[PDB]
Amino acid sequence: MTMDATALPSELLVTPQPLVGFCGLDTARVSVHKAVWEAFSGSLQRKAADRAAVQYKLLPEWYHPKGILKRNWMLKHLHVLPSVVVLFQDMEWNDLQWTEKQVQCAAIVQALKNTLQERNTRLCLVLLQRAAPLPPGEDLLAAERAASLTNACGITSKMLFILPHTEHLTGYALRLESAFLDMAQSYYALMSKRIRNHRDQLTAAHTSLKIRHQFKLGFVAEMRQDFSTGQKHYFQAYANLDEIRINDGNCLEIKTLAGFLNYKICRLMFKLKTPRDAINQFIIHVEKHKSRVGFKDLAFEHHAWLSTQHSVFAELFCEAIKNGLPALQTQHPGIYYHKAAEFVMKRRDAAMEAYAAMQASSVAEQQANMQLCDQERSYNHSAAIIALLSQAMAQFKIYKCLRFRKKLAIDMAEEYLKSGDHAKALTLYSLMLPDYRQEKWTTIFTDVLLKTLRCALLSGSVADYIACSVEALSLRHQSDQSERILILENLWQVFQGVPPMPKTQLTPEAQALWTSALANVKSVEMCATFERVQLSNDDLLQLQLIVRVLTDIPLRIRSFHVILADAGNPQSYYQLFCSTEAQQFHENTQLRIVRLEAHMGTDQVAALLTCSSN
Amino acid sequence: MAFCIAVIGKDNAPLYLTTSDMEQELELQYHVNAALDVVEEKCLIGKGAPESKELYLGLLYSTENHKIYGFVTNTRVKFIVVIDSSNVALRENEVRAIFRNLHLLYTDAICNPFYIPGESLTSKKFDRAVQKLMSGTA
């Protein structure tokens, strides 16, 4: 009829490769088969240029398509069914035990040809003539034993191959691979012809079976490296899907199929390096899809799948990087990494909506749809969101794009906020806030500042909390004055260590958590000036440091401190007595204080605001 | 349709106005738009955007249905607007003209000496000229 091409992801993520089989071989031989398999794993030892694509696997109206009709047929074709069958055996040249070799290899090839009769596959046999090498044209018993084979089965002579000694076995394995390339491409072409002949007939114009056929056609082509032909048959299948009706119960499956198709064709793009072509196909179909659905769209569908769309395309971005293309990433390291990240954000928001529509009183299996939601309720951790953010983070960091990755970092911390996970949010914010002050732009600086307020109060890193709060009061004039007053009260509280006021948010658990704090914690702008330095060991300096408050609200005028320095030798507007210098120290030392540390109101500004000298 | 008219100094946003063909942007997109503009400007500057010729950069960024143009003066000043669409009837020669006029108003405000460089574009007369440019484009 019109059955799905496949509902199976995680398929052929690596470059698809042929498979030729090896039978169930016992441990008794596996040791020497080790060497045997070594040559086989030699395909994985050698460079891709030397490496043959094929690998190994083990086993013990109109008429309906055979080999195409179902997606498990596709997959079983992919790896379960080898294009060619090869059974490796040993052949010691002897007299009558070698006749027993004849009978035994006859039995095994009889079983093998029965299996082939099940599944229409070409066969080859490999024999180690473990004896010493001899010239070709010497062993008539080779012909005799081939004839014993043929009367048993009829396998052609040339399909027989020999790997006498390991030092010989290696080269004979290389040419084995070459011959296998031969037969494998032969079988692949034969199946290609099968598909095209199938496609020339319609079972009463079902029109979707042929879609499966052209899909499998692309499979064949990419097996045979004709990437262009197969990718364009894929795209033609996309066109065919377009011709199909939309918005039915199928349209979601249509969208997923087109996702498969976009995946494959974009692979074949970047293999052929047609970048903007891949971009155009990507967009074209994805906005097709956004149009095609207006609802249901429970938005773990067509939104999460949108996320997976950008996920696969990011996969193909990194695939290009492994290939080495710098184009789109000089443009945008991952155009779609963070994009899929915001798509999983909308995923989670839609999940919140799902909970909302659930909070309604919540017969065509809508409960299963609700059960869908329950399934969708599972993928609500949104930690995978955080990880996708991490990949986008690193991906943009690849070309050292600090700003963008930093703002994705504040994204991460915001998400941890949404999840209620204050800790690591606070960590990333702790990194960002000095950065944001370095960007000098106070607006978002303050916005992440109140975010940090929430983060630290929830965490209880009240040292960090108050540091951000105080550099916030520095220039908090963009915010409410009364909240400045409240926060200043919080400042005196924390300096005393007594619980801070924003109990309007606080709940007792984290409250106690930070009550634990500050037992360990150990430690608006004004100006420093000098009337005289570099003295003649007679001068007397004095308070040239103008203590200015740029906060509208005052801080309680408590007290003062000055800290002595040792270079060379050891020795609105509010001003009050300090007599900072009356100690007649030694000459030519400019004691410029690291930080002010006078006791106005409380200890200090601590967060790194102190000037040098005159 | 909405345009955000933004002049950019070294690191801040001196003057950003979030307007539409009907009025200012009622949508609560202010902070998100400002952050996106700043990140795009920083990345492009790190790449090469700092250059001598008055630099045209159309579709140098692409947000959700808002496509960005950056412009560079040899005096190190940047300029941004967006179009509220993946597709809407407009041109790019109009962008050239409007940001040329934006430069003209920029330097005519730079004429105002009370305006020290690197500050918010405070004057409601200048800003109403800017929103008249807005009306010129939306």
DSSP secondary structure code for residue A439 in this structure: T
What distance in Å separates the CA atoms of residue B104 and residue B98, rounded to the nearest whole number? 10
Q: Give the contacts of B35 (CB within 8 A, at least 6 positions apart).
A: A407, A444
B53 to chain A, any CB pair closer than 8 A? The answer is: no
Would you state the structure tokens that stand for residue A41, as one six-digit string?
A: 């794993």
A 10 A CB-CB count for A349 gives 13
What is the length of chain B?
Answer: 138
Is residue A468 within 8 Å of A449, Cβ to Cβ?
yes
Would you state the structure tokens that stand for residue A397, as one six-digit string?
A: 């960091």
Is residue A289 within 8 Å of A302, Cβ to Cβ?
yes
What distance in Å separates the CA atoms of residue A19 and residue B12, rounded to the nearest whole number? 59
Residue (of B88, B93, B70) closest to B5 by Cα position? B70
Q: Give the contacts of A362 (CB within 8 A, at least 6 positions apart).
A: A370
Q: What is the 3-state secondary structure (H, E, C) of A367-421?
A: HHHHHHHHHHHHCCCCHHHHHHHHHHHHHHHHCCCHHHHHHHHHHHHHHHHHHCC
What distance in Å separates the CA atoms of residue A551 and residue A108, rounded to the nearest whole number? 92
DSSP secondary structure code for residue A79 in this structure: I
For A180-205, the DSSP string reads HHHHHHHHHHHHHHHHHHHHTS-SSS
- Is there a cis peptide before residue A242, judged by omega within 30 degrees of 0? no
B47 to chain A, any CB pair closer than 8 A? The answer is: yes
The CA-CA-CA angle for residues A299, A302, A304, to 5°, reads: 70
Residue (of A60, A50, A288, A88) closest to A177 by Cα position? A50
All residues of chain B having their beta carbon less than 8 Å from the beta carbon of residue A398 are: none
Q: Which residues of A122-160 are buried (b: 16+ CB within 10 A; e: fewer)?
A: bbbbbbbbeeeeeeeeebeebeebbebbeebbebeeebb
Query: What are the residue ranges spanned by the domains of chain B?
Result: 1-138
Is residue B26 within 8 Å of B7, Cβ to Cβ?
no
Residue type, B133: L
- CA separation, residue A396 to residues A307, A362, A415, B33, B39 (Å): 18, 43, 19, 20, 12
Residue (of A423, A436, A352, A341) closest to A389 by Cα position? A341
Residue (of A333, A334, A373, A332) closest to A352 by Cα position? A373
Q: In degrees rounded to 5, what are phi and psi of residue A123?
A: -130, 145
Would you state the structure tokens that stand for residue A537, as one six-digit string?
A: 């060991």
Residue type, A309: Q
Chain B residue with the nearest C-alpha to that of A343: B64
B120 to chain A, any CB pair closer than 8 A? The answer is: no
All residues of chain B having their beta carbon less than 8 Å from the beta carbon of residue A443 are: 13, 31, 34
User: Per the CB < 8 Å rule, is A444 touching B34?
Assistant: yes
User: Per the CB < 8 Å rule, is B42 touching A404?
Assistant: yes
Resolution of the solved structure (Å): 5.8
Chain B residue with the nearest C-alpha to that of A342: B64
What distance in Å separates the CA atoms of residue A448 and residue B35, rounded to the nearest whole number? 12
What distance in Å separates the CA atoms of residue A587 and residue A539, rounded to the nearest whole number? 8
Chain B residue with the nearest C-alpha to that of A335: B62
Q: Give the contacts of A436 (CB within 8 A, at least 6 positions apart).
A: A444, A445, A448
A 10 A CB-CB count for A517 gives 18
Q: Which strand (E) or helix (H) includes residue B35? A: helix B30-47
Pairing outcome for strands A84-90 and A122-128: parallel
Residue (of A337, A414, A348) closest to A379 by Cα position? A348
Mutation pick from A403, A442, A475, A478 vs chain B, by most beta carbons of B within 10 Å, is A403
A 10 A CB-CB count for A497 gives 14
DSSP secondary structure code for residue A214 in this structure: H
Would you state the structure tokens that stand for residue B44, as one six-digit string?
A: 């492009």
Is residue A520 within 8 Å of A495, Cβ to Cβ?
no
Contacts 24+ apart (CB under 8 A), A23-31: A23/A58, A23/A59, A23/A60, A23/A87, A23/A108, A23/A112, A24/A58, A24/A59, A24/A60, A25/A58, A25/A88, A29/A90
- Map residue A162 onto helix, strand or coil: strand
Q: Give the contacts of A306 (CB within 8 A, at least 6 positions apart).
A: A286, A289, A290, A340, A343
First to last CA, chain A: 88
User: Per the CB < 8 Å rule, is A403 touching B42?
Assistant: yes
Of the partner residues A287, A407, A441, the one whose CB lies closest to the CB of residue B39: A407
DSSP secondary structure code for residue B115 in this structure: S
What distance in Å separates the CA atoms of residue A375 and residue A287, rounded to the nearest whole number? 26
What distance in Å separates the CA atoms of residue A391 and residue A341, rounded to the nearest whole number? 9
Is residue B68 within 8 Å of B61, Cβ to Cβ?
yes
All residues of chain A having their beta carbon less than 8 Å from the beta carbon of residue B34 are: 443-444
What distance in Å separates the CA atoms of residue A263 and residue A5, rounded to the nearest whole number? 14
Q: What is the dihedral of CA A480, A485, A488, A493, to 10 degrees?
A: -130
Write out the residues of chain A at the interface with chain B, using a CB-CB cutoff of 8 A: 287, 330, 400-401, 403-404, 407, 439-441, 443-444, 447
What distance in Å separates the CA atoms of residue B56 and residue B75, rounded to the nearest whole number? 15
Residue (of A377, A396, A399) closest to A388 by Cα position? A396
- CA separation, residue B121 to residues A39, B14, B109, B125 (Å): 74, 6, 8, 10
- Map residue B12 onto helix, strand or coil: coil
Q: What is the 3-state secondary structure (H, E, C) of A536-548?
A: CCCCCCCCCCECC
For B48-92, the DSSP string reads T---SS-EEEEEEEEETTEEEEEEEETTTEEEEEEEESSS-S--S
Would you state the structure tokens that stand for residue A476, as one six-digit string?
A: 């908090």
Would you state the structure tokens that stand for residue A276, as one six-digit string?
A: 């903007």
- Residues pairing with B58 in the sheet: B69
Q: In degrees rounded to 5, what are phi and psi of residue B57?
A: -145, 90
User: Per the CB < 8 Å rule, is A447 touching B31?
Assistant: yes
Q: What is the 3-state secondary structure (H, E, C) of A466-515?
A: HHHHHHHHHCCCCCCHHHHHHHHHHHHHHHHCCCCCHHHCCCHHHHHHHH
- Map residue A594 onto helix, strand or coil: coil
Is residue A413 within 8 Å of A428, Cβ to Cβ?
yes
What distance in Å separates the CA atoms of residue A120 and residue A125, rounded to the nearest whole number? 16
A488: Cα within 13 Å, side-chain hemisphere? 18
All residues of chain A having their beta carbon less than 8 Å from the beta carbon of residue B39 are: 403-404, 407
What distance in Å separates the CA atoms of residue A441 and residue A435, rounded to the nearest whole number? 10
What distance in Å separates the CA atoms of residue A65 and residue B109, rounded to the nearest whole number? 76
Residue type, A483: E
Is residue A300 within 8 Å of A346, Cβ to Cβ?
no
Residue (of A512, A507, A518) closest to A461 by Cα position? A518
Contacts 24+ apart (CB under 8 A), A274-279: A275/A320, A275/A325, A275/A327, A275/A328, A278/A313, A278/A316, A279/A328, A279/A335
The sign of the CA dihedral A416, A420, A426, A432 is positive
User: Per the CB < 8 Å rule, is B12 touching A440?
Assistant: yes
Is residue A343 within 8 Å of A312, Cβ to Cβ?
no
Name the residue with tokens 């658990």.
A509
Is residue A556 within 8 Å of A525, Cβ to Cβ?
no
Q: Edge-to-edge, what's the strand order for the sheet holding B2-8?
A: B15-20, B2-8, B77-84, B66-73, B55-63
B86 to chain A, any CB pair closer than 8 A? The answer is: yes
Q: Which residues of A353-364 are buried (b: 16+ CB within 10 A; e: fewer)?
A: ebeeeeeeeeee
All residues of chain A having their beta carbon less than 8 Å from the beta carbon of residue B13 are: 441, 443
Q: Which strand (E) or helix (H) includes residue A38? A: helix A27-45
All residues of chain B having their beta carbon less than 8 Å from the beta carbon of residue A447 are: 31
